[PDB]
Design a protein around this ligand. Structure first.
Ligand SMILES: Nc1ncnc2[nH]cnc12
Ligand SMILES: Nc1ncnc2[nH]cnc12
Lengths: 504, 504
């Protein structure tokens, strides 16, 4: 009929008047042959594969106990609450503190993914998006700061490391010291570190108080399968009954329809696995509720019955303190976070330049203004309370549908503006819904393990120690250090002595 | 000179009179073109790459607490010793029991690797050797029976599972039900199960009471890096001082010269890593001694000062009890050990037949008499107290030097006879010397991970859950079950319903 004919000739005309206006001259839409309409399809598919890190990042930096401390705890029958009693849960005053910080990290992630993505398109003309990157969320929140105020480094110092690393990554890039520096790292340590982070981030998404709750303590094997139904109220311990938890099996169904959606190539599928096992866990009354009948849960439901809200940052705003940079374990956390960002935004940003055909004999057309926008956005992301940004590989779903200019990245920046207003629906995602989303990240990073040269022995001993010691010793710093230490001693003690025997 | 000329013409004549005697007619040395001398070189290189499993198997089945029970414990100030006080160490009576069982497992491994290897050559004419296979040592000793009498299944029942699995693997092979049965298992579950066993067997060789002592307990992260110097006398706990254990750093030096020996292609190198960090840990006086000044250690040194001994099996001889086969977790341990032997001796025994050129369009010349010798040897190995046998992949070092007949496997059977008489030197290998040998096994099994199809999603979700849940939940049965359960639900719920929609 002429109904679709009246629909098709308008899209032949709306794509002309955009290119005949001024906005086609800035983004250069005449060359880089494309139209206005197929840029909008390139940014819709980029956002849906990227919309999961708006909730994963909030539910993983609220476990850090961001600004809640011992002073704003509750009052009990004693004269004063002691040290470790408040920060392990079951409190009227501390749990209402941490419900006002997760509302300040959903807004602070959209405002960090706006500025990173909206400044990528306007300054570099490149079709990809930015957000706080996955992989360095778990290093700061679980290994530097730790689960609810553990560890040694406070959260105010951890947001000062991100500034001083962010300013160290502009002025190692503006001088030209990148190809001199990144090629110094060998291929096997660079490639096996991305596998061990994927196994650390999935062992996070299995524990009792972190994600679903499979693994647990044991007094002779040091880890065992619990999955227990009736557990301890105060702490997490198995009282009895294995594999019959209604919060465990509802999370497995979310893990299947995420994986049954990735095959058959549904673009956004990790967002539909989160929405399905959340929309069951909102009905009051069941055993899988996030809304119980406690006074600690009536305040979340009375905020849920309104579906939109304009919420402002008020707790985890600019909070920096350089008054702790004169001890030892601050700089070790500095040299680790400088290491994992140098290898994250180097192998990704050039690989996403050869898809779509930007590249010539080196030096694609947005080289110099993409290393700095990816670096300055960690500085503006550190004042707002979140971690470093990274150019996402999910942005490839927009490279395979015809996005080639910077109008892709501006529209991606405008869905994050249209998703900070839905704050009452995003703070209320349960921690067993975000569990399988931390496991499918580990599936997609282990897919690079078929490029490690397992033929030679020195390349396989170095790659095995780095992969193994990251999820076991519960440390990312103990896999980077114990990989370089094996790679030198197997190599320096015969080759370097042999070169120094012949160079003189 | 004529000195080597007088050496070379004798080896031209000694190789003739062996082939002109009757012993060249049985093994058929005229065809399969080879001589007597280069068979002896093929069996020397086969033994040295196989001599590590004479000490690893004894130091991993003595941690099981094989026949030592609560009745032959010591006597203390109380009227009777309680249950868990004896079996956790620090006892005059229980520790002298377990020093008489490790002397009955060094002899029982050589007598099991004799009969398996000496009957492979005489009946099948194939050049490889047998011993109790690595991979099923840790399943029985740490996961069925457990560390020193833990768990549910006693050791007398675990040696009855090996009989009833051994007799079930003759009469699934003699009827012809192997190609019908082994091809039913898909490729990804078959291939990823061999990677997760390699990561379970290396997490064993890092713990505080098992191997070296890196990982340890923690009350908030459930695993942490201890490596602590001054520990608890009774139990294992970190009192203070990280990374300064003299038993930790002496084990790292053994891990380097094992790995520095595998590259540059030294044939036996895992045996020289064990001998070097043992021969330092025999000098009385140091901090790394295996011979302290206790009465529990004077009895090991007074047995060490003699260097040869003829020792007889007296504790872990024929000990079978079928009086526990009417409960649940016995058969689950049966179907796991039947699973891992079906996939171990199928992908190995055909791969070691295409090297050396035995094969034609299927059906190499020792098909039917090698599935049964590998199966009947687990029956004769179960009466003597050790686990199932397997055709070793280290036997390939003899396939690449010209071994093609059964005289290779007979001479390998005669080095194990000449290494049961050195029992006082083999019981005295410390548990931190056997530690890195359990880690280089995990390096050599992870080298098959570059053949898993990480392209498709169903092949990568199934392979990731199987690899991850074996070292974490400390279970081999929880990786086989949780791999089939993901592989059906991703596949049966759409394909099988679609086939049943079209078949009718
Ligand atoms: N840190 C990161 N770098 C690149 N792509 C990512 N996708 C998710 N996290 C990422
Ligand atoms: N179980 C096993 N099967 C084959 N080769 C092996 N090498 C060591 N253990 C083995």
């Amino acid at each position: 009929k002429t109904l679709c004919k009246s629909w098709s000739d308008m899209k032949k005309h709306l794509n002309d008047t955009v290119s005949k206006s001024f906005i086609g001259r800035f983004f250069k839409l005449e060359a880089r042959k494309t139209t206005f309409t197929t840029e909008l399809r390139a940014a819709t598919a980029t956002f849906l594969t990227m919309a999961y890190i708006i909730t994963v990042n909030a539910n993983i930096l609220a476990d850090s106990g961001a600004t809640c401390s011992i002073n704003d705890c509750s009052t009990v029958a004693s004269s004063s609450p002691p040290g470790p009693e408040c920060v392990l849960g079951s409190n009227p005053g501390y749990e209402q503190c941490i419900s006002r910080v997760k509302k300040d990290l959903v807004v602070a992630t959209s405002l960090s993914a706006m500025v990173g993505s909206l400044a990528m398109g306007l300054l570099a003309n490149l079709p990809f998006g930015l957000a706080p990157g996955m992989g360095a969320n778990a290093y700061i929140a679980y290994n530097v700061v730790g689960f609810r105020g553990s560890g040694s480094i406070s959260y105010h110092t951890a947001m000062a490391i991100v500034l001083l690393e962010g300013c160290a990554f502009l002025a190692v890039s503006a001088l030209g010291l990148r190809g001199k520096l990144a090629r110094l790292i060998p291929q096997t340590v660079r490639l096996a570190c991305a596998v061990g982070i994927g196994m650390f981030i999935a062992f996070v998404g299995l524990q009792m108080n972190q994600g679903i709750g499979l693994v647990g303590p044991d007094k002779s094997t040091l880890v065992t399968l619990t999955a227990c139904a009736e557990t301890d109220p105060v702490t997490g311990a198995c009282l009895g009954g294995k594999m019959k938890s209604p919060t465990f099996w509802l999370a497995v169904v979310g893990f299947l329809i995420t994986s049954f959606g990735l095959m058959k190539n549904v673009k956004g599928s990790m967002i539909y696995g989160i929405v399905f096992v959340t929309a069951i866990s909102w009905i009051r009354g069941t055993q899988v509720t996030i809304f119980p009948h406690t006074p600690l849960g009536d305040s979340n439901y009375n905020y849920f019955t309104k579906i939109v809200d304009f919420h402002k940052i008020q707790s985890t705003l600019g909070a920096i303190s350089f008054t702790e940079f004169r001890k030892s374990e601050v700089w070790v956390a500095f040299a680790t976070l400088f290491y994992v960002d140098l290898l994250g935004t180097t192998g990704v940003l050039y690989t996403m330049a050869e898809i779509g055909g930007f590249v010539e004999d080196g030096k694609f057309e947005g080289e110099y203004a993409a290393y700095l926008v990816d670096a300055g956005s960690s500085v503006v992301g550190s004042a707002l309370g979140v971690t470093t940004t990274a150019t996402f590989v999910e942005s490839s779903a927009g490279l395979k549908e015809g996005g080639k200019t910077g109008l892709t990245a501006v529209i991606v920046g405008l869905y994050f503006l249209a998703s900070m207003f839905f704050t009452p629906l995003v703070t209320n995602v349960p921690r067993w819904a975000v569990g399988p989303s931390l496991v499918m990240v580990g599936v997609m990073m282990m897919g690079v393990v078929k490029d490690i040269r397992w033929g030679e022995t020195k390349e396989a001993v170095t790659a095995f120690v780095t992969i193994l010691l990251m999820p076991l010793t519960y440390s990312i710093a103990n896999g980077i250090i114990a990989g370089i230490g094996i790679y030198l001693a197997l190599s320096m003690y015969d080759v370097v002595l042999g070169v120094a025997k012949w160079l003189n």
